[PDB]
Structure 1
Amino acid sequence: PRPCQAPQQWEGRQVMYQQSSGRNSRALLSYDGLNQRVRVLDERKALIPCKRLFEYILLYKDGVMFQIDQATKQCSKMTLTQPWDPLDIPQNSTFEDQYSIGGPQEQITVQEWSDRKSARSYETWIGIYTVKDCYPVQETFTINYSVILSTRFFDIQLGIKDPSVFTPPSTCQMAQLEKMSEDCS
């Protein structure tokens, strides 16, 4: 099996697990592969634990990220140290397995890909994409075999419906220069 080409612009929702917190966080996502930008709007279901809701606009072209309190519109601007890393399967990945989620009438077939050298082979980005359309399902990053971060994607709809979602608000002009906490006060 060769790697499919993932769509480069879409919007839906995600659930991100982070080792650093032990927790799952939900958000709306806007992924612009064409423009090497991303926007993440934190979503809440349960009111507890108590946390502040943020909006993130990442603009790898301009080497900057903005983080915006969804309520009060406060804005802190920060550097982009990390290099652009798209949601597609890199051409040299290793095919790991293929499986079916669900059952007859409904099911979906996905493939799992990693970066892993047969001669002492282990996997450090692990991507799950659907077979027919190449939609991203899941992305996991591993250090020394242990999960650091894993994101599930869903409710994917193609394209960016309104690119203004990547336009920071006025409040970012005089933006602060360090990350605002999520902790309830």
Structure 2
Amino acid sequence: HHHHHHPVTPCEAPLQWEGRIVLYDHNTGKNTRATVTYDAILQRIRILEEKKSFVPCKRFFEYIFLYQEAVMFQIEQVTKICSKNTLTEPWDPYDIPENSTYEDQYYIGGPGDQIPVQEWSDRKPARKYETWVGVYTVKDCYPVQETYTKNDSMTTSTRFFDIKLGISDPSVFNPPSTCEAAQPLLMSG
């Protein structure tokens, strides 16, 4: 039997990638499926909601968050109606904060196809419940899952997949021409 040190700090998540996610929102119970272009160097993130067959939702959005310019564009994918809004909130990366609490390492999957991952949190002894848990791969530190009990009880779980390093198509961060735009509230049905 052998004794593995707990890691002194967490691995460093990739800075740029193209991937896909599911965002599960318990306040609404909604699962949102999106293609994501993520760039922590410029602190921008582009989210393209996906439509599946016969979902009861008519409206689907593209989001372009440009934190270095304190603006977010939201575009109805059909109408192409744009909303330009101010971003007050600071950038938040998909990574493990360097002061996170190490929780575990384990294998996801079966024999012959299993992947080692690590789990980290913001657990400390002064607080009964964590607000953040992250599951990242051991080998490349890619995000796998995060749950965020953030926002005073407004919680989400995000699952990450089909991630590919780098950004093959930068143009996605250019807002469309219809984005000579004002600050409308666009929400889904």
Tell whether the structures are fold-level matches, with TM greater than 0.5. Answer: yes
Runs of 4+ in 1 over 4 A off after TM superposition: 143-147
The residue that corresponds to 1:87 in the other structure is 94
**TM-score normalised according to structure 2 size:** 0.90
Distance (whole Å) between structure 1 residues aligned to residue 22 and residue 45 of structure 2: 15
1-side partners of 2:31 and 2:87: how far apart?
A: 24
TM-score by length of 1: 0.92
| Unaligned 5+ runs, structure 2 | 1-6
Q: Structure 1 regions of 5+ residues with no counterpart? A: none
1:155 aligns with 162
Shift of 1:109: 1.1
Report if the CA contact (8 A) 1:140-1:147 is conserved.
no
Deviates more, 1:11-20 or 1:116-125: 116-125
* Greater shift in the superposed pair: 46-55 or 9-18: 46-55
CA contact (8 A) 1:125 1:139 kept: yes
Where do residues 12-161 of structure 1 align in structure 2 (5 Å cutoff)?
A: 12-120=19-127, 122-143=129-150, 148-161=155-168
What residue identity is the alignment partner of 1:149?
Answer: T
| Corresponding residue number in structure 2 for 1:8 | 15
SS at match of 2:68: helix
Instruction: Figure out how many residues of one structure are paired with residues of the other and give that number.
Output: 182
**Following the alignment from structure 1 to structure 2, what is the Cα–Cα distance between the partners of residues 56 and 144?**
21
1:133-158 superposed Cα distances (whole Å, 9 cap, x missing partner): 10000121114996611110100001
Residues in 1 aligned to 2:27 and 2:129: alpha-carbon distance in whole angstroms: 22
Name the CA distance, whole Å, in 2 between partners of 1:16 and 1:128: 15
Amino acid at match of 2:184: E
Over 3 Å counting, the alpha-carbon distance change for 1:20 and 1:3 in structure 2 is same
Q: Secondary structure at the match of 1:34?
A: coil
For 1:43 and 1:123, how far apart are their aligned partners in 2? Answer: 30
